[PDB]
Amino acid sequence: PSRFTKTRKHRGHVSAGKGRIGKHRKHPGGRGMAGGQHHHRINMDKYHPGYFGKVGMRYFHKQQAHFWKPVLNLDKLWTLIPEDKRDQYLKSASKETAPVIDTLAAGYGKILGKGRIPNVPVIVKARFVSKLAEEKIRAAGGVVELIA
Amino acid sequence: RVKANAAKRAEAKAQGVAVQLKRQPAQPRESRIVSTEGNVPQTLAPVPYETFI
Amino acid sequence: AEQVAAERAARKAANKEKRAIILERNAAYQKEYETAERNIIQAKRDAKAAGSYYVEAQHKLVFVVRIKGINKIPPKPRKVLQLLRLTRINSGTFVKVTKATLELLKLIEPYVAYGYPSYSTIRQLVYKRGFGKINKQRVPLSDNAIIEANLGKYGILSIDDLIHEIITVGPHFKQANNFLWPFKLSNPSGGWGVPRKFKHFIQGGSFGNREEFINKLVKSMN
Amino acid sequence: VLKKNPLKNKQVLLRLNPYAKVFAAEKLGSKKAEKTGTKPAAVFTETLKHD
Amino acid sequence: GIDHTSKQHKRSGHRTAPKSDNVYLKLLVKLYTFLARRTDAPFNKVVLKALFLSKINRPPVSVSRIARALKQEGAANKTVVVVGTVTDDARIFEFPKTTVAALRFTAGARAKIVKAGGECITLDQLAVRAPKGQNTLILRGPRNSREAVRHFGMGPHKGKAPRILSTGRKFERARGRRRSKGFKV
């Protein structure tokens, strides 16, 4: 609020926290990103390197639906099965009765392999997958099939 | 100095423990007797100002 | 059956034996003061009888008093004054004479008046103005209990144990002198004896070595 | 609470210094030295006195 | 006037009290200030000084971090004390039986500890069962894993993230960042 600002504490003091010599003006260094190559060059070289220049090729008409690929790691793969069935599926690891995980149903496009699923056979439906994610799923006894 | 301190510590295990490992600075001199046989103190005076040119 | 006499008589017995061992310590330290003084007198007289000259031993201890204020001090003198804990005017401390400490006194010489303190000067100083640095505080000494609490590991059981370790500079001088706070001395009572302080004592001023007249200066400041 | 000076206030001076009662009774600050008749040497005396 | 070797009237720079107006936190400070003063054990001093800590200085401690702490040899029967919150973790699939003394527990963390046979106790329950800190093990969360820390010390040849809204190409990937356009960092 206004009563906890320093403007109320600066009542009486002449420059209101801005200095006698400096004489707080409208825009003494410019406006906005003014002089990022001339007189704020040191700021734009120290704190924001990479500001000036055309890197990369232009991608005309970008839609993020094409780049829709949220990633689910293997340690977060077992979050998908709900807790009412999670303990019944972790215990009694059965090849015949394996939990299927519709990873796309929650909205993860690609399964990655950050590691250490328990040694259970688990059915994984994927749009994409990595090599190490499949090898750890193969090591646990599960299978990955692809959906679209 | 490390080799001397290790050797002095090795000998201090046998005899002369607390063998003064640390360096001491130039301590002020203890009291001494200055005899005067053959050393009668010759008196000195300031020299007069001589131009020496 | 109430635990009154069961701890008061034991504490009074402990205080009586602590006072008895301090009494014989002060008796032992007293008797070595006259022997170390009278043999020095007798060594001078024996050398005079033998036709020689007795060089007395150089003084192991200086008492150094800051006489000039905290303004307009160059940084190399200012660091040494802080290292000797002379932070204000008429702040005194004891400095063990070595070659390292001698060139320190040569470097802050226009700001301090140092000399060789006598036993009477030291014991009057620590009785009147001796304060102990215990947990970064100036607790005044005022009994041998806090001397034993903070200097009992070095064998200093009393203020006279502390006095003897100062005048006869022993192996626990660094611990004992750092325990003593810098002496907040007053201005001298009869003045400084000079019209102008900031010349050398040889040049009729106040700073520098006044070798045995630091007793006349500090007995007036105390 | 209040600092009391030693070398006055003899009860504080006797709270410190258990030797102070013996020092006051035996007068050890004003002790007479032993009389002796050692004479300085002539070589020291004439060096001091010459010219 | 004296030679000021340091700054006079300088505050210690540490918290002597929590900045919060939490009455229940101040009760725990009141209990542990008594415990730090009246016990010679330094466990109560550390817990009190950690109770003062702010939200960025009390990071969350996962139950996987509890499990890694109990995985140390000789610390299986120890009680793990978090002065701060405890969150659960889907990375682990078997939390061992233990008693955990934390300020707050998330509902997943309460489920993970209780269903594993263990119990979630508070810091005053800690004070009752262990005033000097018998067989305890204080666990601290990763302080410098915060997203605000990777922007700290930003400069040339530092390997720090610049402060930037939109991460991608055309946003700080040009001169000053690669050798093709002028210079690289």
Next chain:
Amino acid sequence: SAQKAPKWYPSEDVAALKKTRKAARPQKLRASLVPGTVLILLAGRFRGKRVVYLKHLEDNTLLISGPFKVNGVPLRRVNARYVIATSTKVSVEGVNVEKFNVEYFAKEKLTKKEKKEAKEIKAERVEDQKVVDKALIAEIKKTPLLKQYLSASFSLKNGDKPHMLKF
């Protein structure tokens, strides 16, 4: 409420005082004050009067009587700091001053009721003054001119300096 409340209320009881370590040691007088010396009163009703010092009372005061036949000062107590001891002395070997003390010089029993809004010598005071004067006069007259000295009054003249005038 015009003023809400003070939450911290200071306690209404008074703490007892600490046991003070001050004993009332007896007063040592000046060396020039011997019982039987003559004093000059420096203040009061009898400024400059020469009086005979008789007894040091236990009040720390001084029982004086310049003889009432001589100078008109009665048997009264004064203060040691408000008198000046002259080097000459009188004889008090044969005078009874044993029954003069603090309660002898008590003024009156004072209450709050009988307070004098607007405004007699005791017969016992006159008679003991007489029997003190009978002993005191018999040695005053044995030396010349001392009776004239006590009846006179001291005064500082022009040019005399009390830092060098021996009294």
Next chain:
RNA sequence: AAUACUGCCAGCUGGGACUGAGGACUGCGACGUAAGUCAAGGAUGCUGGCAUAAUGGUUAUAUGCCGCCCGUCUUGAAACACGGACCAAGGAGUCUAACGUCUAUGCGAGUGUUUGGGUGUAAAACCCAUACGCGUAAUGAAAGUGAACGUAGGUUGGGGCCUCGCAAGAGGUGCACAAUCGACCGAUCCUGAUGUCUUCGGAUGGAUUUGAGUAAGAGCAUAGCUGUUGGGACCCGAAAGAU
């Protein structure tokens, strides 16, 4: 032999000044055979006067000494630098969007109800679904690829805990954090395995390379101070320009 001078006394003693802080006891000590007393962790005892303008306060004046007229710009202001005849009222770092650090709070690998819907005592409050935002994964220009050899590694330091230990201290565990050597992931470069639509694939291994990475998550939302940017942007002020 004295005496001067210098120095010492845990020597005595006189006179003066200022201070009386604390408010049961504890403690140290001294004297006394003990009992107790005391100059011993800060003043008590006795006495007198007045009880009101006595003391004190305010105010005016006088006297002694000091004291340049404030604000601002300035290296420097009392300035022969500028503003100010006086008085009353008004009058100048505010709000928003996006954020940064810090702090508080709630929930916490999630978080955020308030776009909307239902309801309501009706712009309030209450309740709610789907998405979406940010976070949980980075890296590359991009195609793409995408984070455990190990008790998530080793070394050094490391609070705290455990064991031994009359007590120092010695071992074991060592969270956070700091430094470093690795390992893994992406990019660059190099060698190129089974294979094969014989031109695709890229296994394995490596580097004076590189990243805003991983290496048992820390974020989201709200609130506040401070700071930034855009806006009139602390207030006021142009010469101008255009319609």
Next chain:
RNA sequence: AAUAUGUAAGAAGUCCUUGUUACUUAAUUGAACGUGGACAUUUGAAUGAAGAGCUUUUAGUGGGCCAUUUUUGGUAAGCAG
């Protein structure tokens, strides 16, 4: 020369034995990093430490001037540097 200035004055160190290397050597040679073992009167000069170290954030400032000493241009300057 004086003054000023760099380094060192140890437990992260010293000594002895034997482990790794794709480095090095003629070599089971050295280098680096080690594993074990011995290292109080003072753990290896003096004095001090008044807490030490680290991190964030941001204000103001970025017109200076004077004095001793050294010193430049100038005849000199309450000159300029």
